[PDB]
Every structure is written in C-alpha cells, then in structure tokens.
Structure 1
C-alpha cells in the first residue's frame, strides 16, 4: 500500500500553474501567426505536448512517479478540458490582432 500525503496537494497544484501559465501565451502566438483552424489545433497539440514532456524533463527530474499518483495519466489528459477552452480564449483574442 503506497502511502499518499497532503504534500501532493501543493505539487499537484503547482503543476497546474505551469500548464495554465503555458496556456494563455499559447493562442496569442497562434493569432499572431494569423492561422486557420485545423493548422491551429495541430500547432496547439505539438506545443502543448512538447511543453509537457520538457516539464517532465526539467522540473520533474524524469521521475513522474514519486511526485504524483497516476502520473502518466495526469501530465497528459488531466486538466485538458480545463485549459483547451482557455486556449480558445487566448486564440480568439490574439487572432483579432
């Protein structure tokens, strides 16, 4: 029985800040590249997942477990509808320039 702690509440929450910080500068770059839609979605996915893996590289020291429970679940698909719509906010507001 692997033990779980309230410690995780911070680092889990900490991760959200990185990704939400990585999710309203995106959209703006999409709008300034003056893009159509599906090109934009594929652009979003490639930047988002490169940010996710490099986050696993650097902040996490290549050890997603021992920092989160269900780590392979959480870095990719958790908080994914929490920020795709924020990306749409960023993309609409950026592309109006």
Structure 2
C-alpha cells in the first residue's frame, strides 16, 4: 500500500518544527514574557506555524504525504518541542 518515502518528508517536517521551537522562546525571552503568558504564546504561535506548514509546503492535502496527518503534524513530537521551547525561553530570559 505505502512505501518507505514517508521517512523523508517526515524528516523535513521534523526539521521545520525543530527550527521553529528555538526562535520561539528565544523571542519570548527577549521580550521577558512571564510564566503562563509564555505557554499560551507558545501554543498559539506553534499551532499557527503548523497550520501555515499545512497550507504552504503541503499543498492543502495532508493526506498523500502522511498517513493520519492530524496525528503526525500536531500531536506527534509535541512533548519533544515544548521542552526545547522551555530551554530556549530560559536561555533568553537570562539575558
């Protein structure tokens, strides 16, 4: 049914998400965002970047490039990206 080409585009998504969780947080630490506003800010901007990724790079068809796309873009690698955001936010708040 499916081939072993999902790994490549999955890796591209992972690179995009990783590179969009260490400039968020750093920006938050530059603005001296406080405890809960920071988390709400991160959730809003991170899901916005996921949506614009679904629109722009993926051509409005999450299927045909991932299987179960709502599971794979949004919920997968979410607790591996809140923590990188926390690291960058702590690094930014201390400068």
TM over 0.5: yes
TMscore range, shorter length: over 0.9
Match of 1:86 in 2: 84
Gaps of 5+ in 1: none
Show CA shifts across 1:48-86 (max 9, x none).
000000000000001000000110111111000111111
The runs of 4+ residues in structure 1 deviating greater than 6 Å are none
TM-score by length of 2: 0.97
Work out the CA distance in 2 between the residues paired with 1:60 and 1:27. Answer: 25
Instruction: State how many pairs are aligned.
Output: 95
TM-score by length of 1: 0.95
Show CA shifts across 1:17-62 (max 9, x none).
0000101111111111111110000000110000000000000001
Q: RMSD over aligned Cα, in angstroms?
A: 0.6
Work out the CA distance in 1 between the residues paired with 2:92 and 2:31. Answer: 9
Work out the CA distance in 2 between the residues paired with 1:12 and 1:36. Answer: 33
Gaps of 5+ in 2: none
